[PDB]
Amino acid sequence: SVQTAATSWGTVPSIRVYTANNGKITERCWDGKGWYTGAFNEPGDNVSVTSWLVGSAIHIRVYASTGTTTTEWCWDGKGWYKGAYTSTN
Amino acid sequence: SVQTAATSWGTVPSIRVYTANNGKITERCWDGKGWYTGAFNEPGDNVSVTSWLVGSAIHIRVYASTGTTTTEWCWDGKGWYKGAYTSTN
Ligand SMILES: CO[C@@H]1O[C@@H](C)[C@@H](O)[C@@H](O)[C@@H]1O
Ligand SMILES: CO[C@@H]1O[C@@H](C)[C@@H](O)[C@@H](O)[C@@H]1O
Ligand SMILES: CO[C@@H]1O[C@@H](C)[C@@H](O)[C@@H](O)[C@@H]1O
Ligand SMILES: CO[C@@H]1O[C@@H](C)[C@@H](O)[C@@H](O)[C@@H]1O
Ligand SMILES: CO[C@@H]1O[C@@H](C)[C@@H](O)[C@@H](O)[C@@H]1O
Fold first, then answer.
1. Is residue B21 within 8 Å of residue A69, measured between CB atoms?
2. CA quadruple A31, A37, A42, A44: dihedral positive or negative?
3. Which CATH architecture has domain A1-83?
4. Three-state SS for A62?
5. Inter-chain contact A50–B2, Cβ cutoff 8 Å?
6. Which of A25, A57, B43, B63 is buried most deeply by CB count within 10 Å?
7. Comparing C-alpha atoms, which of B62, B8, B59, B53 is closest to residue B35?
8. Distance from the alpha carbon of residue A47 to the mean position of ligand 5, in angstroms
9. What is the CA radius of gyration of chain A?
């Protein structure tokens, strides 16, 4: 079966839902109207997510894994880009 | 594939990333500098987390499962400890 993770913020719930389907991740978004498709689209067999606010600004971090390789895609208000997360230190 | 869970708190932020790989879970932490390895080391090929703040003090609960057995692990400001959680009534 597919794998999903979810996060959310505000009183006016915005909710993001990430679905790992067949090695591909699709983001679903809701801002109080209808659900819609977001800009997130990255490879991976499993997902986790978190989010925080700095005032009314959301930051999201998505943790996408395939095999033993975990990648982080960062959302800070502008665009998705590759984060500096690594597994070993 | 590996399975990750993640949580965070604050506006810095702090981020905890737990990974289930080969029946073992290992914690990865970030508090504004680089990523680093956490104190958490528990068996489980599936993980979930949640964290809550009391003022500025973080509390974290990790849900570590193998087979049908779920063990809770707590961080409350000192050391990790085995939670009182049970999955049945
Ligand atoms: C108002 O609509 C209900 O709550 C929203 C926050 C969403 O979770 C939506 O799918 C649900 O049907
Ligand atoms: C404004 O853009 C929408 O919301 C952001 C918080 C992200 O979830 C992004 O992928 C989405 O398309
Ligand atoms: C500032 O660096 C970016 O944001 C941090 C909160 C982390 O998620 C890090 O891995 C990422 O590269
Ligand atoms: C202070 O210790 C660090 O942060 C705590 C909140 C825990 O995540 C712990 O495992 C980690 O080593
Ligand atoms: C006080 O009890 C501890 O903290 C609670 C919030 C629960 O996580 C419980 O299972 C745990 O043993």
1. no
2. positive
3. Beta Barrel (2.40)
4. strand
5. no
6. A25
7. B8
8. 27
9. 13
